Amino acid sequence: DEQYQKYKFMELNLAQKKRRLKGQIPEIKQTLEILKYMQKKKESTNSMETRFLLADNLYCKASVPPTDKVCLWLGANVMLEYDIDEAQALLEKNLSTATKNLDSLEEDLDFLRDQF
Amino acid sequence: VEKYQQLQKDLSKSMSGRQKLEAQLTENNIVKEELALLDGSNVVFKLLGPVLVKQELGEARATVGKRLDYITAEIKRYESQLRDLERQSEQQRETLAQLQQE
Amino acid sequence: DEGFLLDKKIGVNQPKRIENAKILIANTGMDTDKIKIFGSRVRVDSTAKVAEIEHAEKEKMKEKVERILKHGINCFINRQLIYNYPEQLFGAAGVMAIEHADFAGVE
Amino acid sequence: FARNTSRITELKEEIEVKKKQLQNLEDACDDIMLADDDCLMIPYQIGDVFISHSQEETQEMLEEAKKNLQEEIDALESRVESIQRVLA
Amino acid sequence: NLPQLEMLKNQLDQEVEFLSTSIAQLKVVQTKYVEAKDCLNVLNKSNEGKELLVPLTSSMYVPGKLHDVEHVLIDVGTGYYVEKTAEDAKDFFKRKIDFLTKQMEKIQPALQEKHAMKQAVMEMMSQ
């Protein structure tokens, strides 16, 4: 009866959630390890010529001093800047803890939805 | 109809790749065609991931040429599958019709 | 004609000029990538055991001569395909192995 | 529940593509060791930044990426094999 | 006569809707290039080297002065390099935008002209 159609609809509307969530996960990873690996040591050590994004297609050479200043945005209106040690502390939860719930609400949710 | 559907799927998965390679090739053709004559303003290197190495024009030309040959061969492969599908469309589709008729 | 005759083409690589051969039946050729080498045994694993048999099998090339020599060899007969390098090695060893035969005639 | 395919197929394909990416990273390491192996200038990227300074310093992240890929991917290959064996 | 034509008109409608999704793709592909043209004016205004706040992946911002306009870079193909020189960074990426916009005309003109027959099929379907 309707079981097949509703099962397929639930699978589709939860696979879209899967795609979206593992869509934002990679760049927040990048935000963590890019900084924590390169900048936290080398920029805190000495100023170097660098590459920064001018746009998502225009890429421009740059140089950075030990600025050690970083800025986070969650929207088009609200901004906060941070140091180079607490910023990764606040960012690391937003993926390390977020994956456990969101992906369990994905893997375990799929396990249930195969019967739900 | 089994064979017709299989050939349709083969056509689809070959043509998707062919079309995507065409979409990227329509840009790379021009980019390289002025790149081969605008030396000094741009110079050929390889951005093979997160690193840069000095690169020469000839192996890039060989790469794009063998892209072209590969995709043309894939086009003839796809079109051969197209004749295969249209050939099956008669008898592999009459398979059910003749059993329902008699 | 008298004797036991094979309708293949062996030529010189396994020479047609040999005496008092050690005739055997051996159903595994060099194309079989057979596992029984001096190296590691057969495993089903890819963590650290992907293709160690490819490194091990290089021992077979010399073992197929030296083991029979240790037992005692003047020639040898094999009924299966042999890879090239063992082919000239047997040519230098004096072994007449046949590429294929009517396997119903093993008796 | 025969959920193995839905839980092993994507893992197999992603492990394959990660192995291909690691092999290509090894190729890039070899290339920078022979092609444009000039000491004086070499743009090398850490996340979103080039520094055209590292020649021998490239390995400082070459090895990092190598192990962070290989250990995680063969651990997750063992994980997908575990998903396979728990059902069969 | 009429019934079979009306039945196949559903497949005709679905292919037209696929091509309408294609032209919606056409409206959504101009973006990257249109903010590229909008970002043209940053290049010449900052050719002395100037402080920039720029995104890192999408969601991060870090201060940093841009320099070395003589190797401004664009990605292309399988991993090839486009090292934009200084004079190019001032004036010649305008013509580079012209050629990217030329591909944009391969998108809009050269595909709307063949979708004219799509709209003609819509008009003919009334019969």
| Nearest CA-CA partner of D44 in E96, C40, A48, B57 | A48
C-beta of residue A97 within 8 angstroms of C-beta of residue E72 = no
> E45: buried, middle or exposed (CB in 10 Å: 19+, 13-18, 0-12)?
exposed
Q: How far is D45 from chain E, CA to nearest CA, in Å?
A: 13
Helix, strand or coil for residue E65? strand
Cβ <8 Å between D49 and A34: yes
Q: Which residue of B has its CA nearest to E97?
A: B31
What is the C-alpha radius of gyration for chain D, rounded to an integer number of angstroms?
A: 18
| Nearest CA-CA partner of E71 in E94, E54, E50, E88 | E88
> D86: buried, middle or exposed (CB in 10 Å: 19+, 13-18, 0-12)?
exposed
Q: Least CB-CB distance to A53: which of D46, D48, D61?
A: D48
How far apart are alpha carbons C45 and D53 in whole angstroms? 41
| Nearest CA-CA partner of B63 in D33, E77, D34, D32 | E77
What total of structural domains would you count in chain E? Answer: 1
| Helix ranges, chain E (H) | 2-45, 86-87, 93-124
How far apart are alpha carbons E27 and E23 in whole angstroms? 6
Neighbours of chain C (3+ CB pairs under 8 A): D
Q: What share of chain C is helix, strand, coil (3-state, %, to 5)?
A: 35, 0, 65
Q: What is the dihedral of CA C13, C17, C19, C22, to 10 degrees?
A: 20
**Please, what sign has the CA dihedral across residues C12, C18, C22, C23?**
positive
Chains E and C are in contact, defined as 3 or more C-beta pairs closer than 8 angstroms: no
Interface check for C47 against chain D (CB to CB < 8 A): the answer is yes
Domain containing E80 — which CATH number? 1.10.287.370
Cβ <8 Å between E66 and A53: no
Helix, strand or coil for residue B53? strand
How far apart are alpha carbons C93 and C65 in whole angstroms? 7
Q: How many CB atoms lie within 10 A of CB C102?
A: 9
Sequence-distant contacts of E12-16: CB under 8 A, at least 24 apart: E12/E121, E12/E125, E13/E125, E16/E118, E16/E121, E16/E122
Q: Which domain covers residue E51, as residue numbers?
A: 1-126
Cβ <8 Å between D46 and A38: yes
**Please, what sign has the CA dihedral across residues C93, C96, C100, C101?**
negative
How far apart are alpha carbons D28 and D49 in whole angstroms? 17
C-beta of residue B54 within 8 angstroms of C-beta of residue B18 = no
What is the C-alpha radius of gyration for chain C, rounded to an integer number of angstroms?
A: 15
Interface check for D50 against chain B (CB to CB < 8 A): the answer is yes
How far apart are alpha carbons E75 and B51 in whole angstroms? 12
How far apart are alpha carbons E32 and E104 in whole angstroms? 11
Q: How many CB atoms lie within 10 A of CB E47?
A: 15
How far apart are alpha carbons D47 and D30 in whole angstroms? 20
Interface check for D56 against chain E (CB to CB < 8 A): the answer is no
Q: Is B2-101 in CATH node 1.10.287.370? A: yes
The amino acid at E115 = H
